Amino acid sequence: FKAERLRVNLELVINRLKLLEEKKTELAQKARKEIADYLAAGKDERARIRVEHIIREDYLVEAMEILELYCDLLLARFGLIQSMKELDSGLAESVSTLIWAAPRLQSEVAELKIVADQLCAKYSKEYGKLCRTNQIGTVNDRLMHKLSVEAPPKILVERYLIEIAKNYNVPYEPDSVVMAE
Amino acid sequence: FKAERLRVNLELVINRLKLLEEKKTELAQKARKEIADYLAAGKDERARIRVEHIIREDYLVEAMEILELYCDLLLARFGLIQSMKELDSGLAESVSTLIWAAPRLQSEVAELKIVADQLCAKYSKEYGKLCRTNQIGTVNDRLMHKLSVEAPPKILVERYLIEIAKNYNVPYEPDSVVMAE
Protein backbone atom coordinates (compact mmCIF):
# COMPACT_ATOMS: atom_id res chain seq x y z
CA PHE A 1 0.00 0.00 0.00
CA LYS A 2 0.82 3.72 -0.17
CA ALA A 3 2.96 3.72 2.95
CA GLU A 4 4.83 6.96 2.26
CA ARG A 5 1.62 8.78 1.45
CA LEU A 6 0.69 7.31 4.81
CA ARG A 7 3.95 8.59 6.25
CA VAL A 8 3.69 12.15 4.97
CA ASN A 9 0.06 12.01 6.04
CA LEU A 10 1.28 11.25 9.56
CA GLU A 11 3.74 14.10 9.29
CA LEU A 12 0.95 16.48 8.35
CA VAL A 13 -1.10 15.00 11.18
CA ILE A 14 1.70 15.87 13.57
CA ASN A 15 2.10 19.32 12.05
CA ARG A 16 -1.58 20.11 12.29
CA LEU A 17 -1.63 18.56 15.76
CA LYS A 18 0.94 21.09 16.84
CA LEU A 19 -0.81 23.87 14.94
CA LEU A 20 -4.27 23.09 16.29
CA GLU A 21 -2.88 22.65 19.78
CA GLU A 22 -1.33 26.10 19.50
CA LYS A 23 -4.38 27.78 17.98
CA LYS A 24 -6.76 26.23 20.48
CA THR A 25 -4.37 27.32 23.23
CA GLU A 26 -4.49 30.91 22.00
CA LEU A 27 -8.24 31.13 21.64
CA ALA A 28 -8.61 29.23 24.91
CA GLN A 29 -6.70 31.97 26.67
CA LYS A 30 -8.95 34.56 25.08
CA ALA A 31 -11.94 32.42 26.01
CA ARG A 32 -10.72 32.17 29.58
CA LYS A 33 -10.62 35.92 29.88
CA GLU A 34 -14.05 35.78 28.27
CA ILE A 35 -15.21 33.26 30.85
CA ALA A 36 -13.92 35.63 33.49
CA ASP A 37 -16.20 38.17 31.84
CA TYR A 38 -19.28 35.93 31.86
CA LEU A 39 -18.65 34.82 35.44
CA ALA A 40 -18.01 38.41 36.45
CA ALA A 41 -21.07 39.41 34.41
CA GLY A 42 -24.15 37.62 35.59
CA LYS A 43 -24.81 34.23 34.07
CA ASP A 44 -22.19 32.02 35.63
CA GLU A 45 -24.21 29.21 34.07
CA ARG A 46 -23.45 30.74 30.69
CA ALA A 47 -19.83 30.72 31.77
CA ARG A 48 -20.51 27.19 33.00
CA ILE A 49 -21.44 26.07 29.50
CA ARG A 50 -18.48 27.96 28.10
CA VAL A 51 -16.11 26.25 30.48
CA GLU A 52 -17.85 22.97 29.74
CA HIS A 53 -16.85 23.51 26.12
CA ILE A 54 -13.38 24.42 27.33
CA ILE A 55 -12.89 21.40 29.56
CA ARG A 56 -14.15 19.35 26.66
CA GLU A 57 -11.43 21.01 24.58
CA ASP A 58 -8.91 20.17 27.29
CA TYR A 59 -9.93 16.52 27.17
CA LEU A 60 -9.22 16.87 23.46
CA VAL A 61 -5.85 18.47 24.21
CA GLU A 62 -4.80 15.63 26.48
CA ALA A 63 -6.08 13.04 24.01
CA MET A 64 -4.19 14.87 21.25
CA GLU A 65 -0.93 14.64 23.14
CA ILE A 66 -1.45 10.96 23.97
CA LEU A 67 -2.15 10.05 20.37
CA GLU A 68 0.69 12.27 19.19
CA LEU A 69 2.97 10.06 21.25
CA TYR A 70 1.24 7.05 19.69
CA CYS A 71 1.64 8.12 16.08
CA ASP A 72 5.24 9.08 16.68
CA LEU A 73 6.11 5.74 18.31
CA LEU A 74 4.38 3.91 15.48
CA LEU A 75 6.41 6.06 13.11
CA ALA A 76 9.57 4.85 14.84
CA ARG A 77 8.90 1.23 13.84
CA PHE A 78 7.70 2.06 10.34
CA GLY A 79 10.07 -0.16 8.38
CA LEU A 80 10.39 -2.69 11.18
CA ILE A 81 6.75 -3.75 11.48
CA GLN A 82 6.46 -3.08 7.75
CA SER A 83 8.82 -6.03 7.47
CA MET A 84 6.30 -7.86 9.63
CA LYS A 85 2.80 -8.57 8.36
CA GLU A 86 0.78 -8.61 11.60
CA LEU A 87 0.76 -6.06 14.40
CA ASP A 88 2.98 -6.75 17.39
CA SER A 89 2.04 -6.49 21.04
CA GLY A 90 4.51 -3.64 21.51
CA LEU A 91 2.23 -1.55 19.29
CA ALA A 92 -1.04 -3.34 20.03
CA GLU A 93 -2.09 -0.76 22.63
CA SER A 94 -1.28 2.18 20.39
CA VAL A 95 -2.92 0.55 17.38
CA SER A 96 -6.02 -0.43 19.33
CA THR A 97 -6.42 3.03 20.83
CA LEU A 98 -5.80 4.62 17.44
CA ILE A 99 -8.20 2.34 15.61
CA TRP A 100 -10.79 3.01 18.29
CA ALA A 101 -10.38 6.79 18.35
CA ALA A 102 -9.89 7.13 14.58
CA PRO A 103 -13.65 7.21 13.91
CA ARG A 104 -13.86 9.86 16.60
CA LEU A 105 -10.92 11.50 14.81
CA GLN A 106 -12.15 10.84 11.28
CA SER A 107 -13.69 14.32 11.19
CA GLU A 108 -10.85 16.15 12.90
CA VAL A 109 -8.37 15.23 10.18
CA ALA A 110 -8.56 13.96 6.61
CA GLU A 111 -5.08 12.42 6.53
CA LEU A 112 -6.16 9.99 9.25
CA LYS A 113 -8.78 8.65 6.87
CA ILE A 114 -5.97 7.28 4.78
CA VAL A 115 -4.00 6.42 7.90
CA ALA A 116 -6.79 4.16 9.11
CA ASP A 117 -7.31 2.69 5.64
CA GLN A 118 -3.62 1.87 5.36
CA LEU A 119 -3.70 0.49 8.88
CA CYS A 120 -6.50 -1.86 7.91
CA ALA A 121 -4.72 -2.34 4.59
CA LYS A 122 -1.66 -3.28 6.63
CA TYR A 123 -3.33 -6.12 8.55
CA SER A 124 -6.07 -8.71 8.51
CA LYS A 125 -5.07 -10.73 11.57
CA GLU A 126 -7.22 -9.08 14.24
CA TYR A 127 -7.98 -6.62 11.45
CA GLY A 128 -10.84 -5.98 9.05
CA LYS A 129 -14.50 -5.31 9.74
CA LEU A 130 -14.94 -7.12 13.08
CA CYS A 131 -11.44 -8.57 13.45
CA ARG A 132 -10.26 -4.97 13.66
CA THR A 133 -13.20 -4.46 16.01
CA ASN A 134 -11.92 -7.45 17.98
CA GLN A 135 -8.33 -6.20 18.24
CA ILE A 136 -9.38 -2.61 19.01
CA GLY A 137 -10.44 -3.67 22.52
CA THR A 138 -6.94 -2.76 23.78
CA VAL A 139 -7.67 0.99 23.55
CA ASN A 140 -6.14 3.29 26.17
CA ASP A 141 -8.67 3.62 28.97
CA ARG A 142 -6.98 6.82 30.09
CA LEU A 143 -7.46 8.32 26.66
CA MET A 144 -10.93 6.82 26.81
CA HIS A 145 -11.51 9.01 29.83
CA LYS A 146 -9.88 11.87 27.92
CA LEU A 147 -12.18 10.88 25.05
CA SER A 148 -15.25 10.24 27.20
CA VAL A 149 -18.05 12.75 26.57
CA GLU A 150 -19.62 13.44 29.95
CA ALA A 151 -20.35 16.20 32.39
CA PRO A 152 -17.51 16.40 34.94
CA PRO A 153 -18.56 16.01 38.57
CA LYS A 154 -20.12 19.30 39.57
CA ILE A 155 -17.77 19.40 42.52
CA LEU A 156 -15.05 19.41 39.87
CA VAL A 157 -16.76 21.83 37.53
CA GLU A 158 -17.21 23.93 40.64
CA ARG A 159 -13.53 23.43 41.36
CA TYR A 160 -12.68 24.51 37.83
CA LEU A 161 -14.86 27.54 38.39
CA ILE A 162 -13.27 28.03 41.80
CA GLU A 163 -9.72 27.84 40.48
CA ILE A 164 -10.76 30.07 37.59
CA ALA A 165 -12.25 32.55 40.05
CA LYS A 166 -8.96 32.15 41.90
CA ASN A 167 -6.80 32.71 38.84
CA TYR A 168 -9.14 35.26 37.27
CA ASN A 169 -10.28 36.87 40.52
CA VAL A 170 -14.06 36.74 40.22
CA PRO A 171 -16.44 35.77 43.07
CA TYR A 172 -17.71 32.22 42.60
CA GLU A 173 -20.01 30.44 45.05
CA PRO A 174 -20.44 26.72 44.28
CA ASP A 175 -23.76 25.03 44.93
CA SER A 176 -23.07 23.76 48.45
CA VAL A 177 -24.87 20.49 47.71
CA VAL A 178 -22.39 20.07 44.86
CA MET A 179 -19.60 21.98 46.63
CA ALA A 180 -19.88 19.25 49.26
CA GLU A 181 -20.37 16.49 46.67
CA PHE B 1 -19.22 45.52 35.44
CA LYS B 2 -16.82 48.37 34.59
CA ALA B 3 -15.80 49.00 38.18
CA GLU B 4 -12.58 50.89 37.45
CA ARG B 5 -14.32 53.10 34.93
CA LEU B 6 -16.64 53.56 37.87
CA ARG B 7 -13.66 54.23 40.11
CA VAL B 8 -11.97 56.81 37.89
CA ASN B 9 -15.42 58.27 37.38
CA LEU B 10 -15.64 58.72 41.15
CA GLU B 11 -12.19 60.26 41.13
CA LEU B 12 -13.28 62.78 38.50
CA VAL B 13 -16.43 63.34 40.54
CA ILE B 14 -14.28 64.21 43.52
CA ASN B 15 -12.01 66.39 41.41
CA ARG B 16 -14.88 68.31 39.89
CA LEU B 17 -16.52 68.46 43.31
CA LYS B 18 -13.47 70.27 44.60
CA LEU B 19 -13.24 72.38 41.45
CA LEU B 20 -16.91 73.37 41.43
CA GLU B 21 -16.83 74.03 45.16
CA GLU B 22 -13.90 76.37 44.59
CA LYS B 23 -15.37 78.11 41.55
CA LYS B 24 -18.75 78.58 43.18
CA THR B 25 -16.94 79.92 46.25
CA GLU B 26 -15.13 82.50 44.13
CA LEU B 27 -18.15 83.70 42.22
CA ALA B 28 -20.17 83.57 45.44
CA GLN B 29 -17.78 86.06 46.99
CA LYS B 30 -18.14 88.29 43.96
CA ALA B 31 -21.89 87.79 44.14
CA ARG B 32 -21.89 88.70 47.81
CA LYS B 33 -20.23 91.99 47.08
CA GLU B 34 -22.80 92.26 44.31
CA ILE B 35 -25.60 91.56 46.77
CA ALA B 36 -24.13 94.28 48.94
CA ASP B 37 -24.52 96.47 45.87
CA TYR B 38 -28.16 95.53 45.24
CA LEU B 39 -29.05 95.89 48.92
CA ALA B 40 -27.18 99.17 49.06
CA ALA B 41 -28.83 100.13 45.76
CA GLY B 42 -32.57 100.06 46.02
CA LYS B 43 -34.24 96.74 45.37
CA ASP B 44 -33.38 94.69 48.42
CA GLU B 45 -35.94 92.28 47.02
CA ARG B 46 -33.73 91.92 43.96
CA ALA B 47 -30.92 91.23 46.39
CA ARG B 48 -33.39 88.95 48.16
CA ILE B 49 -33.76 86.81 45.05
CA ARG B 50 -30.02 86.92 44.51
CA VAL B 51 -29.37 85.71 48.04
CA GLU B 52 -32.13 83.15 47.59
CA HIS B 53 -30.08 81.78 44.70
CA ILE B 54 -27.02 81.99 46.92
CA ILE B 55 -28.53 80.19 49.90
CA ARG B 56 -29.75 77.62 47.43
CA GLU B 57 -26.15 77.31 46.28
CA ASP B 58 -25.07 76.95 49.90
CA TYR B 59 -27.53 74.11 50.40
CA LEU B 60 -25.79 72.62 47.37
CA VAL B 61 -22.38 73.25 48.95
CA GLU B 62 -23.34 71.45 52.14
CA ALA B 63 -24.94 68.61 50.19
CA MET B 64 -21.78 68.42 48.06
CA GLU B 65 -19.59 68.00 51.09
CA ILE B 66 -21.88 65.37 52.63
CA LEU B 67 -21.94 63.31 49.46
CA GLU B 68 -18.22 63.82 48.99
CA LEU B 69 -17.78 62.08 52.32
CA TYR B 70 -20.19 59.40 51.10
CA CYS B 71 -18.43 58.67 47.83
CA ASP B 72 -15.07 58.62 49.56
CA LEU B 73 -16.23 56.19 52.25
CA LEU B 74 -17.78 53.98 49.60
CA LEU B 75 -14.47 54.18 47.77
CA ALA B 76 -12.75 52.90 50.91
CA ARG B 77 -14.67 49.60 50.77
CA PHE B 78 -14.41 49.21 47.01
CA GLY B 79 -12.85 45.76 46.89
CA LEU B 80 -14.43 44.68 50.16
CA ILE B 81 -18.10 45.04 49.22
CA GLN B 82 -17.08 44.13 45.68
CA SER B 83 -16.29 40.76 47.22
CA MET B 84 -19.82 40.90 48.57
CA LYS B 85 -22.81 40.85 46.23
CA GLU B 86 -25.41 42.81 48.24
CA LEU B 87 -25.03 46.16 49.95
CA ASP B 88 -24.21 46.14 53.64
CA SER B 89 -25.86 48.18 56.36
CA GLY B 90 -22.60 50.04 56.99
CA LEU B 91 -23.05 51.60 53.55
CA ALA B 92 -26.84 51.41 53.35
CA GLU B 93 -27.28 55.02 54.46
CA SER B 94 -24.69 56.34 52.02
CA VAL B 95 -26.03 54.19 49.20
CA SER B 96 -29.64 55.15 49.89
CA THR B 97 -28.84 58.85 50.07
CA LEU B 98 -26.71 58.59 46.93
CA ILE B 99 -29.30 56.63 45.00
CA TRP B 100 -31.92 59.13 46.08
CA ALA B 101 -29.91 62.25 45.25
CA ALA B 102 -28.35 60.80 42.08
CA PRO B 103 -31.37 61.76 39.93
CA ARG B 104 -31.08 65.22 41.44
CA LEU B 105 -27.36 64.95 40.64
CA GLN B 106 -27.78 63.29 37.25
CA SER B 107 -27.53 66.69 35.58
CA GLU B 108 -24.73 68.09 37.72
CA VAL B 109 -22.30 65.39 36.63
CA ALA B 110 -22.09 62.86 33.80
CA GLU B 111 -19.78 60.43 35.59
CA LEU B 112 -22.49 59.84 38.18
CA LYS B 113 -24.71 58.52 35.41
CA ILE B 114 -22.36 55.60 35.13
CA VAL B 115 -21.87 55.56 38.88
CA ALA B 116 -25.58 55.01 39.42
CA ASP B 117 -25.77 52.46 36.60
CA GLN B 118 -22.89 50.50 38.10
CA LEU B 119 -24.50 50.82 41.51
CA CYS B 120 -27.69 49.28 40.17
CA ALA B 121 -25.50 46.93 38.15
CA LYS B 122 -23.83 46.02 41.44
CA TYR B 123 -27.03 44.94 43.21
CA SER B 124 -30.51 43.57 42.77
CA LYS B 125 -31.35 42.82 46.40
CA GLU B 126 -33.16 46.01 47.39
CA TYR B 127 -31.99 47.18 43.96
CA GLY B 128 -33.53 47.61 40.53
CA LYS B 129 -36.56 49.62 39.44
CA LEU B 130 -38.60 49.61 42.66
CA CYS B 131 -36.34 47.44 44.83
CA ARG B 132 -33.80 50.22 44.49
CA THR B 133 -36.70 52.57 45.19
CA ASN B 134 -37.44 50.45 48.26
CA GLN B 135 -33.88 50.49 49.60
CA ILE B 136 -33.39 54.21 48.84
CA GLY B 137 -35.69 55.11 51.75
CA THR B 138 -32.62 55.32 54.03
CA VAL B 139 -31.53 58.64 52.49
CA ASN B 140 -29.88 61.23 54.75
CA ASP B 141 -32.64 63.47 56.06
CA ARG B 142 -30.07 66.14 56.84
CA LEU B 143 -28.91 66.13 53.24
CA MET B 144 -32.58 66.00 52.37
CA HIS B 145 -32.90 69.32 54.14
CA LYS B 146 -29.74 70.44 52.35
CA LEU B 147 -31.40 69.11 49.20
CA SER B 148 -34.87 70.43 49.98
CA VAL B 149 -36.00 73.18 47.60
CA GLU B 150 -37.93 75.67 49.70
CA ALA B 151 -37.97 79.28 50.75
CA PRO B 152 -36.11 79.63 54.07
CA PRO B 153 -38.14 81.15 56.90
CA LYS B 154 -38.28 84.86 56.22
CA ILE B 155 -36.99 85.45 59.72
CA LEU B 156 -33.96 83.50 58.52
CA VAL B 157 -33.74 85.11 55.12
CA GLU B 158 -34.01 88.34 57.05
CA ARG B 159 -31.26 87.07 59.32
CA TYR B 160 -29.13 86.24 56.31
CA LEU B 161 -29.80 89.74 55.06
CA ILE B 162 -29.12 91.10 58.54
CA GLU B 163 -25.81 89.26 58.89
CA ILE B 164 -24.96 90.28 55.34
CA ALA B 165 -25.78 93.90 56.18
CA LYS B 166 -23.63 93.30 59.24
CA ASN B 167 -20.72 91.82 57.31
CA TYR B 168 -21.19 94.07 54.28
CA ASN B 169 -22.30 97.16 56.20
CA VAL B 170 -25.52 98.10 54.42
CA PRO B 171 -28.74 99.22 56.18
CA TYR B 172 -31.28 96.39 56.25
CA GLU B 173 -34.68 96.62 57.93
CA PRO B 174 -36.50 93.26 58.12
CA ASP B 175 -40.25 93.13 57.79
CA SER B 176 -41.15 93.30 61.49
CA VAL B 177 -43.96 90.78 61.01
CA VAL B 178 -41.27 88.44 59.67
CA MET B 179 -38.49 89.95 61.82
CA ALA B 180 -40.64 88.81 64.75
CA GLU B 181 -41.60 85.52 63.06
Side-chain angles (χ1 to χ4, degrees), chain A residues 1-42 45-121 123-124 128 137 140-174 180, chain B residues 1-42 45-121 123-124 128 137 140-174 180:
Chain A
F1 52 90
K2 289 302 298 296
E4 185 58 26
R5 171 167 157 240
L6 172 63
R7 195 155 211 188
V8 303
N9 271 41
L10 278 140
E11 292 154 21
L12 296 179
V13 165
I14 293 154
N15 299 2
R16 77 180 67 259
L17 271 172
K18 299 151 165 172
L19 290 160
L20 214 59
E21 164 184 348
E22 292 148 0
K23 290 189 295 288
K24 83 199 297 193
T25 299
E26 294 166 354
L27 60 91
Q29 180 42 70
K30 319 313 172 213
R32 273 195 306 283
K33 184 55 61 180
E34 189 271 297
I35 277 163
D37 310 344
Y38 280 179
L39 281 176
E45 183 55 64
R46 192 68 149 78
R48 199 162 293 111
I49 307 296
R50 286 303 320 122
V51 75
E52 179 163 14
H53 285 95
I54 291 291
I55 186 61
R56 186 67 65 220
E57 288 293 332
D58 308 343
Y59 295 163
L60 315 184
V61 174
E62 295 152 302
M64 270 204 303
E65 300 307 319
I66 297 155
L67 60 89
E68 201 145 27
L69 267 288
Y70 288 173
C71 84
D72 213 64
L73 68 90
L74 290 159
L75 189 65
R77 298 178 187 168
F78 176 74
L80 179 51
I81 202 74
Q82 188 180 24
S83 178
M84 261 293 286
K85 304 188 173 183
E86 306 177 353
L87 59 91
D88 75 320
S89 60
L91 307 167
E93 173 58 52
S94 290
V95 164
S96 46
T97 316
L98 260 63
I99 283 169
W100 165 73
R104 279 73 180 169
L105 273 296
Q106 268 174 7
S107 43
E108 286 80 330
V109 52
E111 312 310 325
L112 190 143
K113 307 304 292 297
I114 305 161
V115 182
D117 305 322
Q118 304 288 91
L119 265 176
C120 298
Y123 311 108
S124 73
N140 185 18
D141 63 334
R142 183 263 305 285
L143 188 140
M144 196 172 208
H145 161 259
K146 268 71 175 180
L147 202 51
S148 62
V149 182
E150 85 306 343
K154 296 294 105 174
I155 185 71
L156 187 63
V157 188
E158 279 157 343
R159 274 175 294 177
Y160 290 155
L161 296 155
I162 282 155
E163 65 91 16
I164 280 162
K166 169 180 175 292
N167 297 357
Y168 296 89
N169 297 89
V170 302
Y172 180 66
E173 269 62 34
Chain B
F1 52 90
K2 289 302 298 296
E4 185 58 26
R5 171 167 157 240
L6 172 63
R7 195 155 211 188
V8 303
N9 271 41
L10 278 140
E11 292 154 21
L12 296 179
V13 165
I14 293 154
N15 299 2
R16 77 180 67 259
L17 271 172
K18 299 151 165 172
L19 290 160
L20 214 59
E21 164 184 348
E22 292 148 0
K23 290 189 295 288
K24 83 199 297 193
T25 299
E26 294 166 354
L27 60 91
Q29 180 42 70
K30 319 313 172 213
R32 273 195 306 283
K33 184 55 61 180
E34 189 271 297
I35 277 163
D37 310 344
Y38 280 179
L39 281 176
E45 183 55 64
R46 192 68 149 78
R48 199 162 293 111
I49 307 296
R50 286 303 320 122
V51 75
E52 179 163 14
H53 285 95
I54 291 291
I55 186 61
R56 186 67 65 220
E57 288 293 332
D58 308 343
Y59 295 163
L60 315 184
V61 174
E62 295 152 302
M64 270 204 303
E65 300 307 319
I66 297 155
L67 60 89
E68 201 145 27
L69 267 288
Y70 288 173
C71 84
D72 213 64
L73 68 90
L74 290 158
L75 189 65
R77 298 178 187 168
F78 176 74
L80 179 51
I81 202 74
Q82 188 180 24
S83 178
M84 261 293 286
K85 304 188 173 183
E86 306 177 353
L87 59 91
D88 75 320
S89 60
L91 307 167
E93 173 58 52
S94 290
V95 164
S96 46
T97 316
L98 260 64
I99 284 169
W100 165 73
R104 279 73 180 169
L105 273 296
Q106 268 174 7
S107 43
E108 286 80 330
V109 52
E111 312 310 325
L112 190 143
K113 307 304 292 297
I114 305 161
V115 182
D117 305 322
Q118 304 288 91
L119 265 176
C120 298
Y123 311 108
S124 73
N140 185 18
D141 63 334
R142 183 263 305 285
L143 188 140
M144 196 172 208
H145 161 259
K146 268 71 175 180
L147 202 51
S148 62
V149 182
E150 85 306 343
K154 296 294 105 174
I155 185 71
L156 187 63
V157 188
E158 279 157 343
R159 274 175 294 177
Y160 290 155
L161 296 155
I162 282 155
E163 65 91 16
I164 280 162
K166 169 180 175 292
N167 297 357
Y168 296 89
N169 297 89
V170 302
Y172 180 66
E173 269 62 34

